[PDB]
Design a protein around this ligand. Structure first.
Ligand SMILES: C[C@H]1O[C@H](O[C@H]2[C@H](O)[C@@H](O)[C@@H](O[C@H]3[C@H](O)[C@@H](O)[C@H](O)O[C@@H]3CO)O[C@@H]2CO)[C@H](O)[C@@H](O)[C@@H]1N[C@H]1C=C(CO)[C@@H](O)[C@H](O)[C@H]1O
Ligand SMILES: C[C@H]1O[C@H](O[C@H]2[C@H](O)[C@@H](O)[C@@H](O[C@H]3[C@H](O)[C@@H](O)[C@H](O)O[C@@H]3CO)O[C@@H]2CO)[C@H](O)[C@@H](O)[C@@H]1N[C@H]1C=C(CO)[C@@H](O)[C@H](O)[C@H]1O
Ligand code: NA
Ligand code: NA
Length: 492
């Protein structure tokens, strides 16, 4: 049940009309995303401002909590909207309430620890109650992705304040508020998260799915991003030695991610092994949608981020392809899909959304799967960069994107194919990438609730939605897929 949920229902979903669907969901999913964020000017005006619920579901399952990860990812979408709107005050107030509530959560002692522990050990805590209190039940803690994603989101807000609002914050005359300046946000909210990442990146915690302990590609990747992105922020506040500490630590994490210490790049199977310790344990073979979700989050389309493992990385792209192939056989709901399909978390998954039996495809993983080919095309076209296709990825391209032999008949004799910007071959591949991306959004259209809200999961047999209702992260993932689709299609 989800008693606080309010439906929009401002249109009848037509499952035969993708273009119209995506036009309407650009607004409907934003409505549902914002509904789960507490702010005085919003629908959720009775919660502590800055609290993001993962879902209005309070039973079967009970997701009425604030997770550091979901809240940060939610705010990355809010920030994308804020940026597209040339800095909307309403949204900026929501971001600042979230920054303030994050300040309070950071200082809340919990089962992972406290703020005054070494490098703020308490910041590893995955979730809190909506009233701001510590969640004291058993849980897969700590999770070291949260502080990284939050540091990144709040850093990005500061860059936006400086670039789009002439350095001006919007809530600094409110009583509730634990900052008076951008420097206060950096020193007292961003920097503690960065100190946590510096202190704990190479320690044991749970993955983003809250289930396994050890090395995790997504976690290390979002940590590397937060550190790299904060370098210039630190420099801007005359925090130069710390800026260089961030730079060196980011470089160290980049080497970790790319080498045999991390264990993520696996040249036996030529794809990323998301959780290398589980490969060692023989419990999972390493395919995971987090492998491509992370790259998407750490290379936001405005930024031209140079951080490692963008979606063009051959190992990331092969994990994507192989998970797609797996899931097209595993889930009966996918049996008639010729192109994209409903994608889950990992092939070994047993979480059904409210217990254990068999795992399902997830709306968020499916929406992120659309973004992969959209971003390949966008990156190339927007920068006039070549598309380079490594031999590891020839099967993927030949199955879904292009007959490579029509590009270069001798492709099998080369380690790669490079397709020059502006060529007919390039336009063919870019266009075919977008068509392929669209097929994943069609899967969403096939199975979305009539009210336009997205659950956590869709049943692997029937495609009916299941698990947590109107999941904020589902809404965000779809919103970012639509934003990317529109941006790539708008390119001349
Ligand atoms: C919400 C979450 O749920 C499932 O995992 C939970 C359990 O439901 C929960 O009982 C608790 O499990 C412990 C258990 O009760 C106890 O017997 C034992 O000693 O140890 C357990 C903790 O290790 O904790 C876990 C979470 O650690 C799933 O397995 C999860 O995948 C699931 N995560 C979802 C939900 C959200 C919120 O939107 C996302 O942030 C997240 O990425 C997601 O995968
Ligand atoms: C309008 C409706 O559409 C969506 O439902 C889909 C499925 O997602 C989809 O997989 C497909 O279902 C078939 C399925 O593959 C298989 O199990 C079985 O063989 O038969 C199905 C084909 O007859 O087809 C339907 C579309 O007909 C959504 O998933 C739904 O949420 C949606 N609305 C339903 C659901 C509800 C409440 O859950 C009602 O409020 C409503 O009246 C109804 O239309
Ligand atoms: Na104040
Ligand atoms: Na890139």
């Amino acid at each position: 049940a989800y008693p606080s949920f309010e439906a929009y229902s401002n249109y009848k979903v037509d499952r035969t009309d993708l273009e119209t669907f995506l036009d309407k969901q650009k607004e409907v999913s934003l409505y549902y995303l914002l509904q789960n964020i507490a702010y005085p000017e919003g629908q959720f005006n009775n919660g502590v401002p800055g609290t993001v619920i993962a879902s209005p579901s309070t039973s079967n399952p009970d997701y009425y909590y604030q997770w550091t990860r979901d809240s940060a990812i939610t705010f990355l979408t809010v920030l994308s909207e804020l940026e597209d709107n040339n800095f909307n005050t309403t949204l900026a107030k929501a971001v600042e309430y979230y920054i303030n509530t994050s300040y309070n959560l950071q200082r809340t002692s919990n089962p992972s620890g406290s703020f005054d522990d070494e490098n703020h050990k308490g910041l590893g805590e995955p979730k809190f109650n909506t009233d701001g209190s510590a969640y004291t039940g058993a849980w897969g803690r700590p999770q070291n992705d949260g502080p990284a994603l939050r540091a990144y989101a709040i850093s990005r807000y500061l860059n936006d304040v400086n670039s789009l609002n002439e350095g001006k914050l919007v809530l600094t005359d409110s009583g509730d508020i634990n900052f008076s300046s951008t420097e206060d946000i950096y020193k007292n909210i961003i920097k503690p998260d960065l100190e946590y990442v510096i202190g704990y990146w190479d320690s044991t915690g749970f993955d983003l799915w809250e289930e396994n302990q050890g090395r995790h590609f997504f976690t290390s990747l979002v940590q590397q991003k937060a550190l790299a992105y904060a370098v210039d922020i630190a420099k801007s506040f005359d925090d130069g030695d710390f800026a260089n500490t961030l730079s060196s630590t980011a470089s160290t994490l980049e080497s970790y991610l790319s080498g045999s210490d991390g264990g993520f790049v696996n040249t036996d199977v030529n794809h990323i092994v998301e959780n290398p310790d589980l490969l060692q344990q023989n419990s999972r073979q390493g395919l995971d949608s987090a492998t491509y979700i992370g790259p998407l989050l750490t290379h936001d389309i405005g930024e031209s981020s140079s951080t490692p493992f963008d979606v063009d990385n051959e190992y990331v792209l092969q994990s994507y392809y192989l998970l797609l192939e797996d899931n097209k056989d595993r889930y009966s709901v996918n049996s008639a899909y010729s192109a994209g399909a409903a994608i889950g978390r990992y092939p070994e998954d047993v979480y059904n959304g409210d217990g254990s039996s068999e795992g399902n495809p997830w709306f968020l993983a499916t929406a992120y799967a659309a973004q992969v080919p959209y971003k390949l095309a966008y990156d190339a076209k927007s920068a006039s960069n070549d598309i380079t296709i490594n031999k590891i990825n020839y099967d993927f391209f030949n199955k879904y994107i292009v007959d490579l032999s029509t590009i270069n008949s001798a492709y099998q004799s080369s380690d790669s194919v490079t397709i020059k910007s502006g060529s007919d071959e390039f336009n063919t591949v870019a266009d075919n990438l977008v068509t392929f991306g669209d097929s994943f959004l069609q899967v969403i259209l096939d199975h979305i609730n009539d009210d336009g809200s997205l659950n956590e999961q869709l049943n692997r047999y029937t495609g009916y939605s299941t698990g947590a209702y109107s999941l904020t992260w589902s809404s965000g993932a779809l919103l970012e897929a639509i934003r990317l689709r529109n941006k790539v299609k708008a390119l001349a």
